[PDB]
Coordinates of C-alpha atoms and ligand atoms in Angstrom, one line a residue:
Chain A
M1 CA 63.1 22.9 -1.4
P2 CA 60.2 20.8 -0.1
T3 CA 58.6 19.2 -3.1
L4 CA 54.9 18.9 -3.6
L5 CA 53.1 16.4 -5.9
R6 CA 49.6 17.3 -6.9
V7 CA 47.2 14.8 -8.5
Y8 CA 43.7 15.6 -9.9
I9 CA 41.3 12.7 -10.3
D10 CA 38.8 13.4 -13.1
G11 CA 36.7 11.7 -15.7
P12 CA 32.9 11.0 -15.9
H13 CA 30.8 10.9 -12.7
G14 CA 29.8 7.5 -11.3
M15 CA 33.0 5.5 -11.8
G16 CA 34.1 5.4 -8.2
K17 CA 36.7 8.2 -8.2
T18 CA 35.6 9.5 -4.7
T19 CA 36.0 6.2 -2.9
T20 CA 39.4 5.3 -4.4
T21 CA 40.9 8.6 -3.6
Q22 CA 39.7 8.2 0.0
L23 CA 41.2 4.7 0.2
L24 CA 44.3 6.2 -1.4
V25 CA 44.2 9.1 1.2
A26 CA 43.3 6.9 4.1
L27 CA 46.9 5.6 3.9
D28 CA 51.5 14.1 3.9
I29 CA 48.4 13.8 1.9
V30 CA 45.4 16.0 2.0
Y31 CA 42.2 15.7 0.1
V32 CA 40.4 18.5 -1.7
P33 CA 36.9 16.9 -2.0
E34 CA 34.0 17.8 -4.3
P35 CA 32.4 21.0 -3.1
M36 CA 28.8 19.7 -2.9
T37 CA 27.8 22.2 -0.2
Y38 CA 28.6 24.9 -2.6
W39 CA 26.5 23.4 -5.4
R40 CA 23.7 22.6 -3.0
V41 CA 23.8 25.6 -0.7
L42 CA 26.6 28.2 -0.5
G43 CA 26.7 29.1 -4.2
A44 CA 23.2 28.5 -5.4
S45 CA 20.6 26.0 -4.3
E46 CA 20.6 22.4 -5.7
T47 CA 22.8 23.4 -8.6
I48 CA 23.1 19.8 -9.7
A49 CA 19.3 19.1 -9.4
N50 CA 18.8 22.2 -11.4
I51 CA 21.0 20.9 -14.3
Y52 CA 19.3 17.5 -14.5
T53 CA 15.7 19.1 -14.5
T54 CA 16.4 21.8 -17.2
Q55 CA 18.0 19.3 -19.5
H56 CA 15.0 17.2 -18.7
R57 CA 12.5 20.0 -19.4
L58 CA 14.5 20.4 -22.6
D59 CA 14.1 16.8 -23.6
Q60 CA 10.3 17.0 -22.9
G61 CA 10.1 19.9 -25.3
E62 CA 8.6 22.1 -22.5
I63 CA 11.6 24.5 -22.5
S64 CA 13.3 25.7 -25.7
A65 CA 17.1 25.3 -26.4
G66 CA 17.5 29.0 -25.4
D67 CA 15.8 28.7 -22.0
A68 CA 17.8 25.6 -21.2
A69 CA 20.9 27.1 -22.7
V70 CA 20.7 30.2 -20.6
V71 CA 19.8 28.1 -17.6
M72 CA 22.6 25.6 -18.2
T73 CA 25.3 28.0 -19.1
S74 CA 24.7 29.9 -15.8
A75 CA 24.4 26.6 -13.8
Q76 CA 28.0 25.8 -15.0
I77 CA 29.4 29.1 -13.7
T78 CA 28.5 27.9 -10.1
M79 CA 30.0 24.4 -10.5
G80 CA 33.5 25.6 -11.4
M81 CA 33.6 28.3 -8.7
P82 CA 35.4 26.2 -6.0
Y83 CA 37.9 24.8 -8.6
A84 CA 38.8 28.2 -10.0
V85 CA 39.4 29.9 -6.6
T86 CA 41.5 27.0 -5.2
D87 CA 43.8 27.2 -8.3
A88 CA 44.0 31.0 -8.0
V89 CA 45.3 31.0 -4.4
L90 CA 47.3 27.8 -4.9
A91 CA 49.1 28.9 -8.1
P92 CA 51.7 31.2 -6.3
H93 CA 53.1 28.6 -4.0
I94 CA 53.7 26.3 -7.0
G95 CA 57.3 26.4 -8.2
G96 CA 59.4 24.4 -10.7
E97 CA 58.9 20.7 -11.3
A98 CA 61.4 18.3 -9.7
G99 CA 60.7 14.7 -10.7
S100 CA 58.1 11.9 -10.3
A101 CA 62.1 10.3 -6.6
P102 CA 59.9 9.2 -3.7
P103 CA 58.7 11.1 -1.7
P104 CA 57.3 14.7 -1.7
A105 CA 56.6 16.8 1.4
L106 CA 52.9 16.9 0.7
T107 CA 50.4 15.3 -1.7
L108 CA 47.2 17.1 -2.5
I109 CA 44.5 14.9 -4.0
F110 CA 41.8 16.8 -5.9
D111 CA 38.3 15.9 -6.8
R112 CA 38.2 17.1 -10.4
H113 CA 40.1 19.9 -12.0
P114 CA 39.2 23.4 -13.4
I115 CA 39.0 22.0 -16.9
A116 CA 36.1 19.7 -15.8
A117 CA 33.9 22.7 -15.2
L118 CA 35.4 25.1 -17.8
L119 CA 35.5 22.5 -20.6
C120 CA 34.3 18.8 -20.3
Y121 CA 31.0 19.2 -18.7
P122 CA 30.0 22.2 -20.9
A123 CA 31.1 20.7 -24.2
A124 CA 29.2 17.6 -23.1
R125 CA 26.1 19.7 -22.4
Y126 CA 26.7 21.3 -25.8
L127 CA 26.5 18.0 -27.6
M128 CA 23.4 17.5 -25.4
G129 CA 22.2 20.7 -27.0
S130 CA 21.5 22.5 -23.8
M131 CA 24.4 24.8 -24.4
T132 CA 26.1 26.6 -27.3
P133 CA 29.7 26.2 -28.6
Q134 CA 30.2 29.9 -28.3
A135 CA 29.6 29.8 -24.5
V136 CA 31.7 26.6 -24.3
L137 CA 34.6 28.5 -25.9
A138 CA 33.9 31.3 -23.5
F139 CA 34.8 29.1 -20.6
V140 CA 37.7 27.7 -22.5
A141 CA 39.1 31.2 -22.8
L142 CA 38.9 31.5 -19.0
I143 CA 40.6 28.2 -18.2
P144 CA 43.5 29.3 -15.9
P145 CA 47.1 28.9 -17.1
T146 CA 48.3 25.3 -16.6
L147 CA 50.4 24.9 -13.5
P148 CA 53.6 22.8 -13.6
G149 CA 53.2 19.3 -12.2
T150 CA 49.5 19.3 -13.2
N151 CA 48.8 15.5 -13.1
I152 CA 45.4 14.4 -14.3
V153 CA 44.1 10.9 -13.8
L154 CA 41.1 10.3 -16.1
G155 CA 39.2 7.1 -15.7
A156 CA 38.3 4.0 -17.6
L157 CA 35.2 1.9 -17.0
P158 CA 33.2 -0.3 -19.3
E159 CA 29.8 1.1 -20.5
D160 CA 27.4 -1.6 -19.3
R161 CA 29.4 -1.4 -16.0
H162 CA 29.3 2.4 -16.0
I163 CA 25.5 2.5 -16.8
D164 CA 25.0 -0.2 -14.4
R165 CA 26.8 1.8 -11.7
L166 CA 24.9 5.1 -12.3
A167 CA 21.8 2.9 -12.3
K168 CA 22.2 2.0 -8.6
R169 CA 22.5 5.7 -7.4
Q170 CA 24.7 8.8 -7.4
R171 CA 24.2 12.6 -7.0
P172 CA 21.2 14.2 -5.3
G173 CA 19.1 15.7 -8.1
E174 CA 20.8 13.5 -10.7
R175 CA 18.6 11.8 -13.3
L176 CA 20.0 8.9 -15.3
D177 CA 20.4 10.3 -18.8
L178 CA 22.4 7.6 -20.6
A179 CA 22.8 10.0 -23.5
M180 CA 24.5 12.4 -21.0
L181 CA 26.6 9.5 -19.8
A182 CA 27.5 8.9 -23.4
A183 CA 28.3 12.6 -24.2
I184 CA 30.4 13.0 -21.0
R185 CA 32.1 9.7 -21.8
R186 CA 32.9 11.0 -25.3
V187 CA 34.2 14.3 -24.1
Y188 CA 36.6 12.6 -21.6
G189 CA 37.9 10.3 -24.3
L190 CA 38.5 13.1 -26.7
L191 CA 40.3 15.0 -23.9
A192 CA 42.7 12.1 -23.5
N193 CA 43.5 12.0 -27.2
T194 CA 43.6 15.7 -27.4
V195 CA 46.4 15.8 -24.9
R196 CA 48.2 13.0 -26.7
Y197 CA 47.7 14.5 -30.2
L198 CA 49.0 17.7 -28.8
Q199 CA 52.0 16.2 -27.0
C200 CA 52.9 14.2 -30.1
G201 CA 52.9 17.6 -31.8
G202 CA 49.6 18.0 -33.5
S203 CA 48.6 21.4 -34.8
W204 CA 44.9 21.6 -35.4
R205 CA 45.4 24.6 -37.6
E206 CA 47.0 22.3 -40.2
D207 CA 44.7 19.4 -39.6
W208 CA 41.6 21.6 -39.5
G209 CA 40.9 20.7 -43.1
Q210 CA 41.2 17.1 -42.1
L211 CA 37.9 17.6 -40.3
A212 CA 50.6 7.1 -25.3
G213 CA 51.1 5.3 -28.6
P214 CA 50.5 6.9 -32.0
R215 CA 49.2 10.3 -32.8
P216 CA 45.4 10.5 -33.1
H217 CA 43.6 11.9 -36.0
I218 CA 42.6 15.5 -35.1
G219 CA 39.1 14.2 -35.9
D220 CA 39.5 12.2 -32.7
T221 CA 40.5 15.1 -30.5
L222 CA 38.2 17.7 -28.7
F223 CA 38.5 20.2 -31.6
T224 CA 36.1 18.2 -33.8
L225 CA 33.3 19.3 -31.5
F226 CA 34.0 22.9 -32.9
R227 CA 33.2 22.4 -36.6
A228 CA 29.8 24.0 -36.3
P229 CA 27.8 26.4 -38.5
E230 CA 27.6 28.8 -35.5
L231 CA 31.3 29.0 -35.3
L232 CA 31.9 29.3 -39.1
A233 CA 32.1 32.3 -41.4
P234 CA 30.4 32.5 -44.8
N235 CA 33.7 31.4 -46.3
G236 CA 33.9 28.3 -44.2
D237 CA 36.8 29.1 -41.9
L238 CA 36.2 29.5 -38.2
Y239 CA 35.8 33.0 -37.0
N240 CA 39.3 34.2 -35.6
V241 CA 37.6 34.6 -32.2
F242 CA 36.9 30.9 -31.8
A243 CA 40.0 29.7 -33.7
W244 CA 41.9 31.8 -31.1
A245 CA 40.2 30.0 -28.2
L246 CA 40.9 26.6 -29.7
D247 CA 44.5 28.0 -29.5
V248 CA 44.2 28.4 -25.7
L249 CA 42.5 25.0 -25.2
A250 CA 45.6 23.8 -27.0
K251 CA 48.0 25.7 -24.7
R252 CA 46.1 24.6 -21.5
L253 CA 46.0 20.9 -22.2
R254 CA 49.5 20.8 -23.8
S255 CA 51.4 20.7 -20.5
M256 CA 49.1 18.4 -18.6
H257 CA 50.3 15.0 -17.4
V258 CA 47.3 12.8 -18.1
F259 CA 46.9 9.1 -16.8
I260 CA 44.2 6.6 -17.2
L261 CA 43.3 4.7 -14.1
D262 CA 41.1 1.6 -14.7
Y263 CA 38.0 1.5 -12.6
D264 CA 36.6 -1.9 -13.7
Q265 CA 37.7 -3.5 -10.4
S266 CA 37.5 -3.5 -6.6
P267 CA 37.8 -0.3 -4.7
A268 CA 41.0 -1.6 -3.3
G269 CA 42.4 -2.6 -6.7
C270 CA 41.6 1.0 -7.8
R271 CA 43.5 2.3 -4.7
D272 CA 46.4 0.0 -5.4
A273 CA 46.3 0.7 -9.2
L274 CA 46.0 4.5 -8.7
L275 CA 48.9 4.3 -6.2
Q276 CA 51.1 2.6 -8.7
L277 CA 50.6 5.6 -11.1
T278 CA 51.3 8.3 -8.5
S279 CA 55.0 7.2 -8.7
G280 CA 55.5 8.2 -12.3
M281 CA 53.8 11.6 -11.7
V282 CA 55.9 14.8 -11.8
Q283 CA 56.0 16.9 -8.6
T284 CA 57.3 20.4 -8.0
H285 CA 58.9 22.6 -5.4
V286 CA 56.9 25.1 -3.4
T287 CA 57.5 28.9 -3.8
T288 CA 57.7 29.9 -0.2
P289 CA 59.3 27.3 2.1
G290 CA 56.3 27.7 4.4
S291 CA 53.9 27.0 1.6
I292 CA 53.4 23.3 2.4
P293 CA 51.5 24.3 5.6
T294 CA 49.3 27.1 4.1
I295 CA 48.6 24.8 1.1
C296 CA 47.7 22.2 3.7
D297 CA 45.4 24.4 5.8
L298 CA 44.0 25.6 2.6
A299 CA 42.9 22.1 1.5
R300 CA 41.7 21.3 5.0
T301 CA 39.6 24.5 5.0
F302 CA 38.1 23.8 1.6
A303 CA 37.1 20.3 2.8
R304 CA 35.7 21.2 6.2
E305 CA 33.5 23.9 4.6
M306 CA 32.7 22.6 1.1
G307 CA 32.7 18.8 1.6
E308 CA 29.6 16.8 1.5
Chain B
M1 CA 63.4 43.1 -27.1
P2 CA 61.4 46.1 -28.3
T3 CA 59.0 47.6 -25.9
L4 CA 55.2 47.7 -26.0
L5 CA 52.8 50.1 -24.4
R6 CA 49.3 48.8 -23.7
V7 CA 46.5 51.1 -22.6
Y8 CA 43.0 50.0 -21.7
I9 CA 40.6 52.9 -22.0
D10 CA 38.0 51.9 -19.4
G11 CA 35.4 53.5 -17.2
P12 CA 31.6 53.7 -17.4
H13 CA 30.0 53.8 -20.8
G14 CA 28.3 56.9 -22.1
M15 CA 31.3 59.1 -21.3
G16 CA 33.3 59.4 -24.6
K17 CA 36.2 56.8 -24.4
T18 CA 35.3 55.5 -27.8
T19 CA 34.9 59.0 -29.2
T20 CA 38.2 60.2 -27.8
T21 CA 40.2 57.0 -28.5
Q22 CA 39.6 56.9 -32.4
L23 CA 40.6 60.5 -32.6
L24 CA 44.2 59.7 -31.4
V25 CA 44.5 57.0 -34.0
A26 CA 43.2 59.3 -36.8
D27 CA 53.2 52.8 -33.6
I28 CA 49.5 53.1 -32.3
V29 CA 46.9 50.4 -33.0
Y30 CA 43.3 50.3 -31.6
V31 CA 41.4 47.2 -30.6
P32 CA 37.7 48.5 -30.7
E33 CA 34.5 47.2 -29.1
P34 CA 33.6 43.6 -30.2
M35 CA 30.2 44.8 -31.2
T36 CA 29.8 42.3 -34.0
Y37 CA 30.5 39.6 -31.5
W38 CA 27.8 40.9 -29.0
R39 CA 25.2 41.4 -31.8
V40 CA 26.0 38.5 -34.1
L41 CA 29.0 36.1 -33.6
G42 CA 28.7 35.0 -30.0
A43 CA 25.0 35.2 -29.6
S44 CA 22.2 37.6 -30.8
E45 CA 22.0 41.2 -29.9
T46 CA 23.2 40.5 -26.4
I47 CA 23.0 44.1 -25.3
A48 CA 19.3 44.4 -26.1
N49 CA 19.0 41.2 -24.0
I50 CA 20.9 42.6 -21.0
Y51 CA 18.7 45.7 -21.1
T52 CA 15.4 44.1 -21.8
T53 CA 15.8 41.6 -18.9
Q54 CA 16.8 44.4 -16.5
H55 CA 13.7 46.1 -17.8
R56 CA 11.3 43.1 -17.4
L57 CA 12.7 42.7 -13.9
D58 CA 12.1 46.4 -13.1
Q59 CA 8.7 46.2 -14.8
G60 CA 7.8 43.3 -12.5
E61 CA 7.2 41.0 -15.5
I62 CA 10.0 38.5 -14.5
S63 CA 11.7 37.4 -11.3
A64 CA 15.1 38.2 -9.7
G65 CA 15.9 34.6 -10.2
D66 CA 15.0 34.6 -13.9
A67 CA 16.8 37.9 -14.4
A68 CA 19.9 36.7 -12.6
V69 CA 20.0 33.6 -14.7
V70 CA 19.9 35.3 -18.0
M71 CA 21.9 38.2 -16.7
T72 CA 24.7 35.8 -15.7
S73 CA 24.9 34.1 -19.1
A74 CA 25.1 37.4 -21.1
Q75 CA 28.1 38.6 -19.2
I76 CA 29.9 35.4 -20.1
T77 CA 29.3 36.6 -23.7
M78 CA 30.2 40.2 -23.2
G79 CA 33.6 39.5 -21.7
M80 CA 34.6 36.7 -24.2
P81 CA 36.6 38.8 -26.7
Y82 CA 38.6 40.4 -23.8
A83 CA 39.6 37.1 -22.3
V84 CA 40.6 35.3 -25.4
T85 CA 42.5 38.5 -26.3
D86 CA 44.2 38.6 -23.0
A87 CA 45.0 35.0 -23.2
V88 CA 46.4 35.1 -26.7
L89 CA 48.4 38.2 -25.9
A90 CA 49.8 37.2 -22.5
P91 CA 53.0 35.3 -23.6
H92 CA 54.3 38.2 -25.7
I93 CA 54.4 40.4 -22.7
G94 CA 57.8 40.7 -21.1
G95 CA 58.6 42.6 -17.9
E96 CA 58.2 46.3 -17.2
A97 CA 60.9 48.1 -19.0
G98 CA 61.7 50.8 -16.4
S99 CA 58.7 53.0 -17.4
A100 CA 62.0 52.5 -21.6
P101 CA 60.8 54.6 -24.6
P102 CA 59.8 55.2 -27.3
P103 CA 57.8 51.9 -27.3
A104 CA 58.1 50.0 -30.6
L105 CA 54.2 49.8 -30.6
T106 CA 51.3 51.3 -28.5
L107 CA 48.2 49.2 -28.2
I108 CA 44.9 50.9 -27.3
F109 CA 42.3 48.6 -26.0
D110 CA 38.6 49.4 -25.7
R111 CA 38.1 48.1 -22.1
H112 CA 39.8 45.5 -19.9
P113 CA 38.7 41.9 -18.9
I114 CA 37.7 43.4 -15.6
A115 CA 35.0 45.5 -17.2
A116 CA 33.3 42.2 -17.9
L117 CA 34.8 40.0 -15.2
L118 CA 34.4 42.5 -12.3
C119 CA 33.0 45.9 -12.9
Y120 CA 29.7 45.4 -14.8
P121 CA 28.9 42.2 -13.0
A122 CA 29.3 44.2 -9.7
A123 CA 27.0 46.8 -11.2
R124 CA 24.2 44.4 -12.3
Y125 CA 24.5 42.7 -8.9
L126 CA 23.7 46.2 -7.4
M127 CA 20.7 46.0 -9.7
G128 CA 19.0 42.9 -8.4
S129 CA 19.6 41.0 -11.6
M130 CA 22.7 39.1 -10.5
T131 CA 23.9 37.1 -7.5
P132 CA 27.0 38.1 -5.5
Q133 CA 28.1 34.5 -5.6
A134 CA 28.0 34.8 -9.4
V135 CA 30.0 38.0 -9.3
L136 CA 32.7 36.2 -7.4
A137 CA 32.8 33.4 -9.9
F138 CA 34.1 35.8 -12.5
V139 CA 36.3 37.6 -10.0
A140 CA 38.2 34.3 -9.6
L141 CA 38.2 33.9 -13.3
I142 CA 40.0 37.2 -13.6
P143 CA 43.2 36.4 -15.5
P144 CA 46.6 37.2 -13.8
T145 CA 47.5 40.8 -14.3
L146 CA 50.2 41.0 -16.9
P147 CA 53.1 43.6 -16.4
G148 CA 52.6 46.9 -18.1
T149 CA 48.9 47.1 -17.3
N150 CA 47.7 50.7 -17.6
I151 CA 44.0 51.5 -17.1
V152 CA 42.5 54.9 -17.9
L153 CA 39.3 55.5 -16.1
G154 CA 37.2 58.6 -16.8
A155 CA 35.7 61.5 -14.7
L156 CA 32.6 63.3 -15.9
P157 CA 29.9 64.6 -13.5
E158 CA 26.6 62.7 -13.3
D159 CA 24.7 65.4 -15.3
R160 CA 27.1 65.6 -18.2
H161 CA 27.4 61.8 -18.2
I162 CA 23.5 61.6 -18.4
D163 CA 23.8 64.0 -21.3
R164 CA 26.5 62.0 -23.1
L165 CA 25.1 58.6 -22.2
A166 CA 22.0 59.9 -24.0
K167 CA 23.9 61.2 -27.1
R168 CA 23.0 57.8 -28.5
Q169 CA 23.9 54.5 -27.0
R170 CA 24.4 51.0 -28.5
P171 CA 21.9 48.8 -30.5
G172 CA 19.4 47.7 -27.9
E173 CA 20.2 50.0 -24.9
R174 CA 17.6 51.8 -22.9
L175 CA 18.5 54.8 -20.8
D176 CA 18.6 53.3 -17.3
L177 CA 19.8 56.2 -15.0
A178 CA 20.1 53.7 -12.1
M179 CA 22.5 51.5 -14.2
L180 CA 24.4 54.8 -14.6
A181 CA 24.4 55.3 -10.8
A182 CA 25.3 51.7 -10.2
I183 CA 28.1 51.8 -12.8
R184 CA 29.6 55.1 -11.7
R185 CA 29.7 53.9 -8.1
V186 CA 31.5 50.7 -9.1
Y187 CA 34.4 52.2 -11.1
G188 CA 34.5 55.0 -8.6
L189 CA 35.0 52.4 -5.9
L190 CA 37.5 50.5 -8.0
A191 CA 39.5 53.6 -8.3
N192 CA 39.8 53.7 -4.5
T193 CA 40.4 50.0 -4.3
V194 CA 43.6 50.2 -6.3
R195 CA 44.9 53.0 -4.1
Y196 CA 43.8 51.1 -1.0
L197 CA 45.7 48.1 -2.1
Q198 CA 48.8 50.1 -2.9
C199 CA 48.9 52.1 0.3
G200 CA 49.2 48.7 2.1
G201 CA 45.6 48.0 3.0
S202 CA 44.6 44.5 4.1
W203 CA 40.9 43.6 3.6
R204 CA 41.1 40.8 6.2
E205 CA 42.6 43.2 8.7
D206 CA 39.9 45.9 7.8
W207 CA 36.9 43.8 7.2
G208 CA 35.3 44.5 10.6
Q209 CA 35.0 48.2 10.1
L210 CA 32.2 47.8 7.7
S211 CA 30.3 46.7 10.8
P212 CA 47.5 57.2 3.6
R213 CA 44.6 55.3 2.0
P214 CA 40.7 55.3 1.6
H215 CA 38.3 53.7 4.2
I216 CA 37.5 50.1 3.3
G217 CA 33.8 51.1 3.0
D218 CA 35.0 53.0 0.0
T219 CA 36.5 50.0 -1.8
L220 CA 35.0 47.1 -3.8
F221 CA 35.1 44.9 -0.8
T222 CA 32.2 46.7 1.0
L223 CA 30.0 45.3 -1.8
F224 CA 30.8 41.8 -0.7
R225 CA 29.2 42.1 2.6
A226 CA 26.3 40.4 0.8
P227 CA 24.5 38.4 3.5
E228 CA 24.5 35.5 1.0
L229 CA 28.3 35.5 1.4
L230 CA 28.0 35.5 5.1
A231 CA 27.8 32.6 7.5
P232 CA 24.9 32.3 10.0
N233 CA 27.2 34.0 12.4
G234 CA 27.9 36.9 10.0
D235 CA 31.2 35.5 9.0
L236 CA 32.4 35.3 5.4
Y237 CA 32.9 31.9 3.9
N238 CA 36.4 31.0 2.8
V239 CA 35.4 30.6 -0.8
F240 CA 34.3 34.2 -1.2
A241 CA 37.1 35.4 1.1
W242 CA 39.4 33.7 -1.3
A243 CA 37.7 35.2 -4.3
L244 CA 38.5 38.5 -2.6
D245 CA 42.1 37.5 -2.1
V246 CA 42.2 37.1 -5.8
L247 CA 40.5 40.4 -6.5
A248 CA 43.2 42.0 -4.3
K249 CA 46.3 40.5 -5.9
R250 CA 44.7 41.4 -9.3
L251 CA 44.0 45.1 -8.8
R252 CA 47.0 46.0 -6.6
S253 CA 49.4 45.6 -9.5
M254 CA 47.4 47.8 -11.9
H255 CA 48.3 51.3 -13.1
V256 CA 45.1 53.4 -13.3
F257 CA 45.0 56.9 -14.6
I258 CA 42.2 59.4 -14.5
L259 CA 41.0 61.2 -17.6
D260 CA 38.7 64.1 -17.2
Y261 CA 36.0 63.6 -19.8
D262 CA 34.2 66.9 -19.0
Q263 CA 35.9 68.8 -21.9
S264 CA 35.1 68.6 -25.6
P265 CA 36.8 66.0 -27.9
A266 CA 40.5 66.3 -28.8
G267 CA 40.5 68.2 -25.4
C268 CA 40.0 64.7 -24.0
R269 CA 42.0 63.1 -26.9
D270 CA 44.8 65.5 -25.9
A271 CA 44.7 64.5 -22.3
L272 CA 44.9 60.9 -23.4
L273 CA 48.2 61.5 -25.1
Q274 CA 49.5 63.4 -22.1
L275 CA 48.8 60.6 -19.6
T276 CA 50.8 58.2 -21.8
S277 CA 53.9 59.7 -20.1
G278 CA 53.6 57.7 -16.9
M279 CA 52.2 54.5 -18.2
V280 CA 54.4 51.5 -18.0
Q281 CA 56.0 49.8 -21.0
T282 CA 57.0 46.2 -21.3
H283 CA 59.5 44.4 -23.5
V284 CA 58.0 41.8 -25.8
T285 CA 59.0 38.1 -25.3
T286 CA 60.1 37.2 -28.8
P287 CA 61.6 38.9 -31.9
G288 CA 58.4 38.5 -33.9
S289 CA 56.2 39.5 -30.9
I290 CA 55.2 43.1 -31.9
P291 CA 54.1 41.9 -35.5
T292 CA 52.0 39.1 -34.1
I293 CA 50.7 41.6 -31.7
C294 CA 49.9 44.0 -34.5
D295 CA 47.8 41.5 -36.5
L296 CA 45.9 40.5 -33.4
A297 CA 44.7 44.1 -33.0
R298 CA 43.9 44.4 -36.6
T299 CA 42.1 41.0 -37.1
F300 CA 40.1 41.5 -33.9
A301 CA 39.3 44.9 -35.3
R302 CA 37.9 43.9 -38.7
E303 CA 36.0 40.9 -37.3
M304 CA 34.5 42.2 -34.1
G305 CA 34.6 45.9 -34.3
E306 CA 31.4 47.3 -35.8
Ligands
PE2_1 N1 29.9 21.1 -14.1 C1 29.0 20.2 -14.4 N2 29.0 19.1 -13.7 C2 28.1 18.3 -14.0 C3 27.1 18.5 -15.0 N3 26.3 17.4 -15.1 C4 26.8 16.6 -14.1 N4 27.9 17.1 -13.5 C5 28.7 16.5 -12.4 C6 27.7 16.4 -11.2 C7 27.8 15.1 -10.5 C8 27.7 14.1 -11.6 O1 26.6 14.4 -12.5 C9 29.2 14.9 -9.9 O2 29.2 15.9 -8.8 C10 27.0 19.7 -15.8 O3 26.3 20.1 -16.7 N5 28.1 20.5 -15.4
PE2_2 N1 29.7 43.5 -19.7 C1 28.6 44.2 -19.5 N2 28.5 45.4 -20.2 C2 27.3 46.0 -20.0 C3 26.2 45.6 -19.3 N3 25.2 46.5 -19.3 C4 25.7 47.4 -20.0 N4 26.9 47.2 -20.5 C5 27.7 48.2 -21.4 C6 28.7 48.0 -22.5 C7 28.8 49.4 -23.1 C8 30.2 49.6 -23.6 O1 30.2 51.0 -23.6 C9 27.9 49.6 -24.2 O2 28.5 49.1 -25.5 C10 26.3 44.3 -18.6 O3 25.3 43.9 -17.9 N5 27.5 43.7 -18.8

């Protein structure tokens, strides 16, 4: 059947993921861009400006953890909306994997992946204290089942160079919170190891008490963020409820094909560099033969209406 | 593999599910209300929070915005146990075994992910304390409907419900008769929605009427004619229209059965055992599935049931 190769470009904001993918796309391929219009208009109203202000009000000590928590938690629900719906309608047409030989019938490039809204950003906001780990796990329990051929390209960029970049300018409503850059960096690192650890066979349940290449110490995976007095019983173990969610986080990430593109270069180098990774990425067949078109018109509709 | 029979006793609160469900149990396990999770574990006394906020809104002390915001977060917390459960359970579910009995194990659940991912949220929306966009965020998050999904919804006339809803109701509640009118309307609609979807109805093909099956104005789609969802030219944006596509594939495959709650206990408890006859069973995926599945229902029970 016609194969389809999907690739999600994720990682912290401000590294140059949007450009590169354009350059990549500018060259069969459709682009599912960031739904700003949803965040700005359709879904709420300046969702991203809302996020940055609340956390700010929180840092000023004008809003209490709970007011920012309740405001943050709900601001996240809006962010992941477009990712979640796209997956939901996409899922059916996705069939069994085929194999990284050139080429596919279609290539869908994504700007971020469900996990970025249902995990990374929240966990990050949690370390930032504007969110709880209970809520964080709530999203984790909603992360959709991982689809075959789910290729995730996270991104590497030096700090000074990343800070430097954010410094110049980025999203409308965005405030330069270096600490946030730090958290969000941390979370995307962990995420990488987490996949690795998991793929190498880690089993957090065994390594709990301990709280490509070699297997990372569970203490270096995302789990570690979940060793908190909120999530622990009077006898120290995690409440089964959360443990069980860490068990889904594990299942979700366990089948992902994660890659690290380097962003410490020219937009073109990033394009060329990201292109040389797309070749070792696993693709899949479609479910209906006429899925390529609908999957196509689907991405073009998302773009035309949510892009900005 | 052995078969399993899962039943999700749903419907509006204040009718007697809880009351009638325990009775059957006292082969059959019972996964209760995660009350300890709503009160303690996930956050603090969530319910009193849901009700207060609605109150403050009603009593003009707070704004629809402020309500919506807190109202949204809370739901996240109310549905948590359902999701994780559904997600930890999922793989043990094999395909529909004919109807093939007697099942090696019967699981009775106290509500389905939809109560927290669709129903109540639809209800609070209808209350001014929650955005339709928000409601569709959870509708999309609705997990794929597993095979052998049987939902029991309850019938009890408004008056009797008012009476039972007032018998006593949860730590923190406040009798909100409107929230009773909102909630009854929702499940009622959902009842029609499942039949709509099974008699072959297409919401895209019917969507313009709002301006053998039930009329689309008598389904959960009619709620999403929320102007906020509509384009300047009245149209419905593709995001929501997709959310609705989801909502449809989700419900259509459900098996919903009606339990008349207007009849004293055991009388309802009886009817609950009678319905069990047409509910679909499933095989489990692995040898040790049933046992793992038993523990889940017992460990959720001791930890979250209060
Ligand atoms: N989901 C979510 N996304 C967040 C958060 N902060 C920044 N972003 C990404 C927003 C821009 C970068 O800041 C990129 O569009 C947050 O709390 N949640
Ligand atoms: N998910 C959700 N549930 C709500 C809300 N309001 C009342 N309930 C009722 C729950 C009842 C179960 O019978 C009382 O325990 C709400 O806003 N969201």
